[PDB]
Structure formats: C-alpha cells, structure tokens
Amino acid sequence: EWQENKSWNAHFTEHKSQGVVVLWNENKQQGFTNNLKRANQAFLPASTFKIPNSLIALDLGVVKDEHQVFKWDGQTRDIATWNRDHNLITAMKYSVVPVYQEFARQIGEARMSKMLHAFDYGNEDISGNVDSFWLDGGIRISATEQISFLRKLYHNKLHVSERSQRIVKQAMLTEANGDYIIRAKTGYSTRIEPKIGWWVGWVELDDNVWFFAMNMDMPTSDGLGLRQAITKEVLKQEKIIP
Ligand SMILES: O=C(O)c1cccc(-c2ccccc2F)c1
C-alpha cells in the first residue's frame, strides 16, 4: 500500500533543504513517499488551513458565495496584495490571513471545533486564539492526514453541503492546461519551530487523480518558490505530468 523511495531525498538535499513529498494514486489506492517518518509528523497547517476554514464559513453562511466582497479594513500591512478588497477566490490566491481571521471570529470556537472533528482534520485541536490557532496554536496535521482530508473533499464526502465543497475546489484552482489540472493550497509556517512550507492538493488527469502533500524546511522566505517547483519536478520524474 505504501512504498518509501529514499532516493527522492535528492530533490530536497540538492537545495540544501530537507522535506517530504507524499503521493497517492487514487485509481490504484497506493501511496509513495521519500520519508515515511516525516510523512506522519504533524506540523502547523498555517495557510493550508484556509481549505477547511473556507468550507466551514460557506456552510454556516458566514460567506454567502465566491463573489462576496470582503472590504479591506484600512490597516496597512507589509503584504501589498493584502491592502485591497478580496473575494473568496482572491483571498485564497493571495493567502490573505486577515480575511480568514475574521471568518474564524464569526465561526466561533464552538462551531470551529465541532466541524474540525466532523472533518477528522489533523489533531482537531483549536487550542489557542480563535483568530490565529492555525498559525501559533495547538492544531497540527501531517502530510498523510492532509491527503486523507483532501480525498474526502474531492469525493464530496465531507460533512458539509456539496455546494460548499464545489466552491472551495473552485477556489483551489491553481493551474490548468491541456495535460492536467492542479487544485492546491500553499502554506508557510514561521511562528513555531521548525519553520516550514507546505503545498497540498491534487492533479487531475483524463483517467486518474494523484493527490499530493509536501512540506519542507523554510528557514527564510527566499525558498518559498521551491514548494511548487520541487513537487512538480517529482510529478514529472514519476511521469504523472509531462
Ligand atoms: O507564498 C505565498 O503565497 C505568500 C502569500 C502571502 C504572504 C507570504 C509571505 C511571504 C514572506 C513573508 C511573509 C509572508 F506571509 C507568502
């Protein structure tokens, strides 16, 4: 069911880094990784939490649809793309933390905890501040656990409406061409050691789907582009994408 290929570590060590990539072949129900131990180690989800947060906000009516405008609160932040109005699509695309912090405040502790348990999401622990627990609270999730959650979303099997799941999968759209579609979400965790980057999602082909979840050491922001680049290089090596 699971195969470990330690030779794939070169994808990370060649960049003076360390990390894990986990792949899941949906048709064959088989998984692959470079490091079984790190594949099951739990990290802060950081901005990958925008996936469950979006689902919960939509299903509770906190967000009406993907067109609703969330007005900039007028506070200048150091990320230029955050100093503007957003909807669900652009908030996901630019990982706009302050929009999702307001989502969480409106969801509230009780409903957030209840829904993460219903999702079987990570350690299901929202200890910390309701508007930042996915950045510096007690919640943790592993790469393998990300795969399990994403598979439920793909199949519309999460305990929210089909509509809510379709809208979030639209918002996850990252790349599409004549060969494949990628729906995914990046993450960047800096408030608790070790600092890491995430990329989780899946690749749609004509006749199969490959789920993926990766994290890697991220001592500075200079390496953030390696999250997608390394993953796509693994996918190409495995002849999943051209
Ligand atoms: O990688 C991203 O999509 C992304 C989106 C928003 C902010 C950031 C970021 C970059 C450097 C330092 C702190 C940060 F939050 C990264």
Swiss-Prot record:
Induction: Expressed from an upstream promoter, P(out), in an insertion sequence IS1999.
Activity regulation statement: Inhibited by avibactam, related diazabicyclooctane (DBO) derivatives and by bicyclic boronic acids, via a covalent binding to Ser-47. Inhibited by chloride, bromide and iodide ions. Not inhibited by the beta-lactamase-blocking agents, clavulanic acid or tazobactam.
Catalytic reactions on record: a beta-lactam + H2O = a substituted beta-amino acid
Keyword Signal among record annotations: yes
UniProt enzyme class: hydrolase
Assembly, per entry: Monomer. Dimer.
Other facts: When OXA-48 is present in clinical isolates of K.pneumoniae, increasing chloride concentration during antibiotic treatment reduces bacterial growth.
The protein, known as: Beta-lactamase OXA-48
Provenance organism: Klebsiella pneumoniae
